[model samples]
Target: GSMSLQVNLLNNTFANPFMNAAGVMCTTTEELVAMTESASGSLVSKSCTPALREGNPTPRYQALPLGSINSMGLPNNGFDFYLAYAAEQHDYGKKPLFLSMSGLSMRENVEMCKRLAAVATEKGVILELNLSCPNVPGKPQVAYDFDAMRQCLTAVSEVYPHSFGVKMPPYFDFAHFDAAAEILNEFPKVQFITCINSIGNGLVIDAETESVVIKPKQGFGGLGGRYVLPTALANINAFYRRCPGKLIFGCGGVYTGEDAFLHVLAGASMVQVGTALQEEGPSIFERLTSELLGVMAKKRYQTLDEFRGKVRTL
Candidate 1:
């Protein structure tokens, strides 16, 4: 229990540059706190909206050999409930927390941000806009369209002057990244970028039933777990190379400390473990941190900053 080996433990800015991607909604703050205690740095709470959402129908999740997808809409207890719950559970003085928000319409999104801005400012939690959910049909996946994306960001940026970032999907056209960057550059208050939600809406058919695995509905769900790591890393590297000076939080297919370190080497400032946590439990954090330190020692790397993006040029 020498705590000294726990690199940057006291820094509190984020120790090993890894966090939980929003959407692992624990039922209570005590549960939330337990999860955060196992993470490297912070936790972005499950996406919240102004109103409570029942979310998509049952069979929301389907597991594949390589990965799994989920059609879980932004299901939550709404903002007021979340805020009140956090008030009782949140001790910001202990750990950093990000309040993730979502909205069905532009006006609603803005209003939610305004309210969260006041709450977060008072409570000291950061904010993350969940702009990547694809459950909404007929739109270009919110994070994929420039104009729509800008409008959403602008709406939140106007009222929220705190550290804010956008959570985006991995399967987007690279062009959209440029468009987003241009708009985000206008507002210096926007602090970071989390690239790549699960690879999604991927359908799996049951040969016998002649219907999809999750069947008879939206046809597919978002893909995550060990299978999508390569795709996730590719996206992370792509964004890291394309957008300089932007802090990138990488997620997808991260099950081990080496996987996390691989992301860091690929130019991610931080990595996230969502699916892995589902598979391995809270001890995964301790396991990953230990393995990462071993990798560092073997490689003779002094600090995470030193190894970050080391392989990008190659």
Candidate 2:
């Protein structure tokens, strides 16, 4: 096969472009190892807090008509767990791994970044700052606050000047995008942007039962899957256009090869699978890789850059 899916970013080149979105099948060592064993090009640890968190109440997620919703409140096996896990392997040339952090407070985030800086040389880990986890009841998404975002990234950079990226919530307004990109552009150390964290605070109610779908926050949760493809593409493209030199990771509503192709066209250097990966498990990657290749072959395209970020308007 002449198809190529390699993507180079965050100082390493990956063999493919498929990986599980954070919080999707990455809560344990077993799960992270499974992601490595699968067809995914890379794997990311579950977003971590300074201390372990059990997350929200039960009935936090459910499959819906065209999409799914969840109020998972950032549960994870603390940062130390992943640090030790990656240190044991201590090699990224074989396969790259992303270490995600979603610290609960500004102080916690800076502390975690400082710690990650100490471990960077020893662990060979790619760090991602998760700025959007909608289920945290009292906390507003960090990225939504431009001034706060600038402050946090500035503070983190002062402690950890290594290559790092941010996972951003989707912005619906062009002005919002401009403002967000303006802040992001200020930090040269902010190497990549993973766009469109599940649309926040959607309430899904069942007509038949006359009740809310998920039990968290009165059925309000982040929305994902088919309901978000168009918006996902728009945000991915918007950021791609605005941030001239940064890598973009597309996530949301990607279930098939066509969806993946659309993501690439919209300028996602890589696409993260969430709802579908959650439902289908690691095996989905095999099919996703196959289908993505088929789509490329059908289009007679040899490389992603050939058409990536080159969508035409008529």
Candidate 3:
């Protein structure tokens, strides 16, 4: 039997379930256009701030043996740049587009949401509110602060009144997961949650030089790639169980179809590639698509829903 890669997420159809994670090859139009033309079923813009930011100094990222680490400090094109792309004419029938917003403050986030409210549905754009940027030097991750997350959601939901989602940082404890899910469940408008933004504040040391890898934050940065797969799956499963009403998008150490399949089994509707995509480029999506299909074929499955969230507890 033939396998199908299509997926319906947040009321949008995707040709496949793979896409690039925010902050990867999506900071510019050229990159985004590459994604638009790539095999990925959907695409997301880089996390945008209110204004253009240079972010941290040079050497902010380092590729490690198992994964990679970065203190990119939320560098991105301004919100208007992405909004213009979203507002522009595109073949929405081919692939759905998502705009990722990472405001420096609740006030800034609210303002951007209000601005997008006018054109989101008209342009067929989805919003992914980033509440888990850990590379910012001084700012704390909003998802880690339950009350602040609630307040931020409250402010934005009032203005947008449309189905949106949040990108969340990884949570270790069951209590943290329970609390965060409780807060997210309260918002009827939040239709999805992207789980496990890179594991934050991981330091990769260069043993030969006796120094840290990245320049920013004394070499401390968010961890991604193979190193983060377990954490990502755990978070995905945690939220998948807690917030039964919301869809889950998985991100972390996804380098192959096996990783993506693991995430789906853990309850993710979509699998986002980060470090791997950065290294492999848009072509990686095609490879992932084929490999994922191979896995499904071997398992005697034809569709993602056949195994999604069906991980056995053993």
Candidate 4:
């Protein structure tokens, strides 16, 4: 089938299951709108905070030849700005929108999401709680703090009746995976989970200068692209097996249709592109769509469900 990237998610039939990962090409309404204009199936906004943040200082994000590295320090236009834009201007009929929120605290997260729910009422816009914002300082990522994650989800689930999901950080240990999934499974209202939000706190040393590439936290930054693909896939499949009832949105190391195909094979209902999109811009979606269709045709696959989550057991 040509141009057959469509997939149904959470009662809404989407054009495709591809979109920019949170924090990629989504710092403003202009970028979010551009994604809507792009060939991708959907658009997700940047992780919004209660207050605007200028984020980490200069040289925070360095795109290397091998994927990219960043310590953006949770820079954003704040929660109010994104909600206002979505409610006033964004047309839900054209494309689905996922408004991401990464507040400084769980209370803020709950309140912001409450407002998110109020504005998104019947708009079909959804909330994506970023539990893995590596750029924020002093505040620990909630995904790693298992109990904190439970608390946040508990609060949000109690308050917001609408659909929402969590953006989770990569978990290496099987125990953590089990524990995390256990917590996530408790919140039936948590309709989806985006896996592997950068391998947090990775240091890249520049051999030429013998110095760290990024400027935040003494050169510590969340690793992306090529570095995290295997780990990303592992998290996706692991949770795929564990949380069979939940939808997985795979993020990490997805640069091509082949990569996207592999992610779907591993059990991702949707794939989000990061470093590649940052390198190529919105046009990358067109190339990716072309590549995915070509791969499907070569394999005689008629639809995405034909191969999704059907990775070999050997």
lDDT of each: 0.70, 0.86, 0.90, 0.87
lDDT by residue for model 4 (1-314), tens: 44478899887777777899999999987898899889998888889889999999879999987778889988899988898878887877788888998987777888887787778775778888888853346557778887778888888888887878899999989999999999999988887889879998888899999999888789988889988999999999999989988999999999999999989998998899989999999999999988999899999997889888899997
| Candidate order by decreasing TM-score | 3, 4, 2, 1
Which residue pairs clash within candidate 4?
A: none
Expressed as tens digits, the lDDT of each residue in 1-314 for candidate 3 is 97898899777788898989999999998998899999998889999998999999989988888999999988888999999989885567679998999997778988999889877878879999998853345547778777778888998988886899899999999999989999999998999999879888899988899999899888888999889989999999999999999999999999999899999999999889999998889999989999999999998999999999999997
Best-fitting candidate, measured by lDDT? 3
lDDT of 4 at 77: 95
Evaluate model 1: give its TM-score.
Answer: 0.88
Worst 10 residues of 3 by lDDT: 133-142
For residues 1-314, could you state the per-residue lDDT of candidate 2 as single tens digits?
48798888766888878999999999887898788888888888899998889999988889876889999988898988877777775346557888889987778888887778767776668888987743246657788877678888888888886888899999999999999999999988888899878988888888899999888788889999999999999999999999997989999999998999999999999899999999999999999988998999999987788888988879
Candidate 2 colliding pairs, count? 0
Which ranges of candidate 2 are over 4 A from the true structure? 89-94, 133-139
Q: In model 4, which regions exceed 4 Å deviation?
A: 1-3, 134-140
Q: What is the lDDT of candidate 2?
A: 0.86
TM-score of each: 0.88, 0.96, 0.97, 0.96
Where is model 1 more than 4 Å wrong at Cα? 1-12, 25-27, 134-137, 172-174, 207-210
Q: Per-residue lDDT of 69-126 in model 1, one digit per residue for the tens? A: 6777777878776666555567665566767777777777777766666677567677
